[PDB]
Amino acid sequence: GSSGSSGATPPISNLTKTASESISNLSEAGSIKKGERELKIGDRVLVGGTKAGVVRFLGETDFAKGEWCGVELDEPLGKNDGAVAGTRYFQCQPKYGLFAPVHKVTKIGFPSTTPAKAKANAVRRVMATTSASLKRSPSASSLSSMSSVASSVSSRPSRTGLLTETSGPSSG
Numbered sequence: 001g002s003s004g005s006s007g008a009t010p011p012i013s014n015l016t017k018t019a020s021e022s023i024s025n026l027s028e029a030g031s032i033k034k035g036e037r038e039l040k041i042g043d044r045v046l047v048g049g050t051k052a053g054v055v056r057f058l059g060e061t062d063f064a065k066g067e068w069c070g071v072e073l074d075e076p077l078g079k080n081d082g083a084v085a086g087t088r089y090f091q092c093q094p095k096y097g098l099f100a101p102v103h104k105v106t107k108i109g110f111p112s113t114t115p116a117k118a119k120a121n122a123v124r125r126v127m128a129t130t131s132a133s134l135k136r137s138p139s140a141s142s143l144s145s146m147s148s149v150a151s152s153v154s155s156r157p158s159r160t161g162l163l164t165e166t167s168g169p170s171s172g
Contacts, residue, residue: 039069039102046108047100051077056090061099069102 001007019025024032039045043055057070062084072078072092081094090097115125 037102039105039107044108044110045069045071046106047071047104051075051098052108053098056092056097059089062087064099064101067102068099069105070097070099071105072096073098 039055039058041055041058044052045055046052051073053071053073055069056072059067059070061068070089072090073096076095078094078096078098080097080099082088082090082092082097084099089099114127117126119126
């Protein structure tokens, strides 16, 4: 190593190993953090029991002192349009973008992971509820059918002529 005149040749080598515990091993900074009560992007959530939106952004806020979840409200119950004191987060319509603490954000559920139930019974993937008539409210329903929009489409600007805009109309 130093007091051996000349010994720059290791005694055989081929087997090696790294890391001692955990699975992480590349760069302790980000990439994969994995939490416990953290929400994911594109997930319906409820806050307070009235405001229900979807996880659009996820990071560290500026006005707060912790990690908040930027959820866009489908209904007019927001405040900012994605911008916060100059800082941009998610591009959405005004009066929709809202920011709330993850711990304060509650989950409602979403259709996707059905098999992953963690309950062995007999058959593969269980799904047999009680055939009832009252679920929660007549207003609330599933995705079976709804009233869509319909109209004639000719596509031919004979009166209109707004090729390029410069000002940008808002009211009217």
